[PDB]
Amino acid sequence: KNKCVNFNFNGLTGTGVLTESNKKFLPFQQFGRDIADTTDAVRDPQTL
Amino acid sequence: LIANQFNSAIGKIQDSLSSTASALGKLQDVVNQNAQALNTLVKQLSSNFGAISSVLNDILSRLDPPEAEVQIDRLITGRLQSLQTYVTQQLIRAAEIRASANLAATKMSECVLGQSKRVDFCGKGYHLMSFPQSAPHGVVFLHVTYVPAQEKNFTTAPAICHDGKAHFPREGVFVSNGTHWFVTQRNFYEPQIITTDNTFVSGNCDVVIGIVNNTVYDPLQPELDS
Amino acid sequence: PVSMTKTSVDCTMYICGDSTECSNLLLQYGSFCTQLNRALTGIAVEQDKNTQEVFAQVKQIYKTPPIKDFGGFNFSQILPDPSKPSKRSFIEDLLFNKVTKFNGLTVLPPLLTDEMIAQYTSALLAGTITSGWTFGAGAALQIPFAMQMAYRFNGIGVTQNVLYENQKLIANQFNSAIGKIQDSLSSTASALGKLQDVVNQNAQALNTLVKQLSSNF
């Protein structure tokens, strides 16, 4: 976390800083998107 | 009275700005027209333009360079066209904003730093002064102007005969309330006795159309008579 | 020039007329079509705003009195002529007779009809003739047209006695100048060339656009 890294989450690859999210996804939800439909939040496969 | 009218007008400006958003609509339009454009630009990153995927990183991960090259070329063409469209619309909008800013600078020069004789350049009525106020990406001019209010009918004449001489108003007009003739300033009813100090002589009675008969007071004559 | 024709072009039917396959393929580009439609809509609304700003400069529709006693100045050829079905002046009708598709291309009618623009010009002209510049600053203040002309002579640095002593010479010069305006407009088309240029420059563009439907690319 808190470091600019290349990440791969269940085939979603991206470069960014991963921070602890206050977003509370519904249990079926896996990703999050902005008004522009860019990936905003992700769910860790290992731990929810 | 004039101080109270100015104060009340400033209060009404406050009341208009505190309850009507659409008043600053123009500035908001600019803030909208840019943002919409930006949104559109970013939305074009989500388009395929004929490629297998809009995501560039999902092409390189799934294809060999010889095959990924065609899809990346499609994406490049589409995104380049989108960016060119954005830049062209922004150049035209910048020309519009530069025209508006030149008008605002001219209004600051001729309207705040001076008194403008240009009609409606500085709002309804006869311009007295203007006050600038900063606004988000713009300027707001409070134009203080003079509007004539309570009108009254009078009989009028272009000139007056005294002793075969035609008298014309030095400034103002000859007005009759119905029995007596005065000379007043044109923008405010302040009737005055028609004297040789109020008027000037030019030729005789025959030439002028609509000339009327009256007496022209000579301020010297009572003093000289004594 | 004040406004131009409010042309709207449907992006989808111009590119992909009555074709679902072509429309589905055009969907791959995204908001290309919607933003072109938005730009043309902005242009049309701007044309309406242009006409409103130029002509809707008067709060009331002023009348010239039935008795046209303007100190010998003759405005009959610029004032409205009720005989004509459109309440336009003689000079306005001279002007309108000198200035001379289905692929998603529509032409939106202007918000103000030619009759309403004629009523604006009639109101402005009547206010100028009957009240001078007073109607522009506030309530219209009637003043004899001779005395308004004296006001304006004072404005250009000439004493009003020059007007009053030369009134009918000045009225005759004004009338002759209006007659010469009529003669110039009745025999020279190129006079209104500027307006015609706009009418040409739009139409040519539209032609070009439709001609591009006949290209293979």
Added chain:
Amino acid sequence: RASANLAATKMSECVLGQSKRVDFCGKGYHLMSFPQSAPHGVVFLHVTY
């Protein structure tokens, strides 16, 4: 739009008033102006001295 802004300014300063601006309202010393509607435009008859 630039042309229409100029036309609106000429209507304000030239028809609704007397302009001291030189050549803004035609050859000579501006006395008055009269507007006339034209197809997609305006025609100013500038009366000058």
Added chain:
Amino acid sequence: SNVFQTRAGCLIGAEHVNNSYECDIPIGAGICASYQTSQSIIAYTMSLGAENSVAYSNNSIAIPTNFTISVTTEIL
């Protein structure tokens, strides 16, 4: 169920009203719409403004006897 034929096209759901008002929603060739009255959408020929004959005469002048100080806002 009102269907009214204008020069701008076919207008459905707006009641044609003979009265002329200031333009509220610009529809087309002199036709504007507004929400009025019970409440309904109406279409009408837009009114250009109050119709006023000036009391012109060869010897009549109207002189102001008072004034008002008006502060107006211009936004650029």
